[PDB]
């Protein structure tokens with residue numbers, strides 16, 4: 001399966017033709033303020049240098065496999081553990097976030113994918129209500145260099161080849177996300193790649209993260225994908241809400 | 252395990268000493284209004300007279316087994332199938348609802364227990380978030396005989412003996428429930444008896460249903476429980492929220 005060309009995603013996976021898919025356009029006017037949405041809580045995200053983490057060019061994104069012991073609660077009794085993170089980006093002068101806000105696509109996006117503690121393995125969680133949870137944050141151009149991201153971005157040249165991987169030292173994974181864990185959008189959707197299973201809880205931070213222009217250029221310019229083509233515009237088409245309401249943790 | 256007497260439930264089921272147990276005390280002022288909570292959808296509940304339904308005295312409640320095809324939705328793509336219903340009640344001069352509202356215990360309470368359609372079996376759903384869903388309504392005293400309830404109450408004498416069961420004609424299950432399906436409380440808790448599995452979505456109707464004094468009496472005074480004892484006061488003490496915010500579908 002590719003972004004751009006065949007084969008169609010319903011052929012690969014029947015769930016990619018579900019009604020309740022991701023990503024979506026967030027329209028903050030229409031979001032339902034939901035005071036039950038408490039600040040997100042992360043434990044175990046400040047990793048030491050060892051053991052190292054596998055960072056892989058899988059042809060569709062760059063993905064960092066996360067170790068055991070990274071705990072994330074969406075709220076009391078809604079407990080998850082982090083599996084992996086990866087990135088969606090565009091090209092030169094072209095945005096590549098997956099979610100949009102009032103139609104606005106941001107330069108790039110980070111996803112931290114999590115498994116409910118009620119499930120041992122992802123294949124039991126797929127399609128199950130709240131079985132997976134993704135924390136999503138937009139990345140935007142800023143004046144300073146983001147040092148948290150530099151740790152990863154400086155290693156992309158090593159994994160330029162599609163299907164290549166490298167080991168990188170542990171870092172503060174939470175420093176790859178906004179500092180504000182209290183202001184966010186939440187909706188139920190899907191994985192954005194086959195098998196596109198539904199039952200996924202998406203939490204999209206209102207605060208963005210800032211990368212420098214070069215940092216964003218490193219991301220979008222370094223990696224290679226299927227064929228003899230660049231790994232760029234690695235975002236799925238926005239999907240209709242189809243009557244889902246997006247909640248907001250804030251008024 | 253028994254109602255109102257040892258062994259203490261965490262010795263039977265350590266699950267019963269979980270942090271996120273049911274029932275709870277609902278305090279409407281502290282409930283969070285969540286506008287994304289849409290009206291409950293219940294299709295297939297208007298059953299014809301045949302086939303008949305199993306109604307059992309199991310010593311803990313009276314339980315009606317529901318056939319396939321009672322479909323219920325809590326939200327878009329969040330669907331369920333009804334499995335069974337049962338009641339909780341007190342005794343002469345004493346209310347026996349499970350949930351409470353600002354401390355008020357109501358005469359009785361109906362529970363309609365459902366299984367997420369994302370799970371083929373109940374046993375897969377136990378302990379999984381949103382795997383089971385219960386619709387709860389309070390029953391209070393009112394002036395009129397309730398004719399929906401009369402179909403069950405009038406059959407209790409035939410199953411007075413613990414462990415005895417009877418077949419009853421199909422009835423309209425939706426008629427046992429309150430008027431306004433748009434107005435309810437919602438939180439995540441547990442089964443209210445061992446095994447006290449968590450991940451249960453509880454939806455408690457704001458509005459009640461009314462039964463005559465003679466009907467409540469018939470419910471509390473007809474059935475026999477374990478040993479040589481009266482099946483009465485079959486409710487669980489309310490449980491702390493432990494950070495859980497009860498949500499309300501209405502301002």
Ligand SMILES: NS(=O)(=O)c1ccc2c(c1)S(=O)(=O)N(CCc1ccccc1)C2=O
Pocket residue numbers: 083084111113122123132134190191192193194195
């Ligand atoms: N772009 S994204 O954030 O939504 C995303 C998209 C797809 C997938 C994942 C995340 S995944 O959960 O790691 N994952 C798990 C891999 C897996 C699939 C089946 C069985 C076992 C593991 C995905 O497929």
Ligand SMILES: NS(=O)(=O)c1ccc2c(c1)S(=O)(=O)N(CCc1ccccc1)C2=O
Pocket residue numbers: 335362364373374377383385441442443444445446
């Ligand atoms: N007060 S109440 O609504 O919350 C309630 C209490 C106890 C139980 C159920 C509901 S149950 O889900 O049918 N159930 C099912 C048990 C079961 C487990 C595996 C297979 C089949 C049934 C219960 O024990």
Ligand SMILES: [Zn+2]
Pocket residue numbers: 086088111192
């Ligand atoms: Zn993604």
Ligand SMILES: [Zn+2]
Pocket residue numbers: 337338339362443
């Ligand atoms: Zn019950």
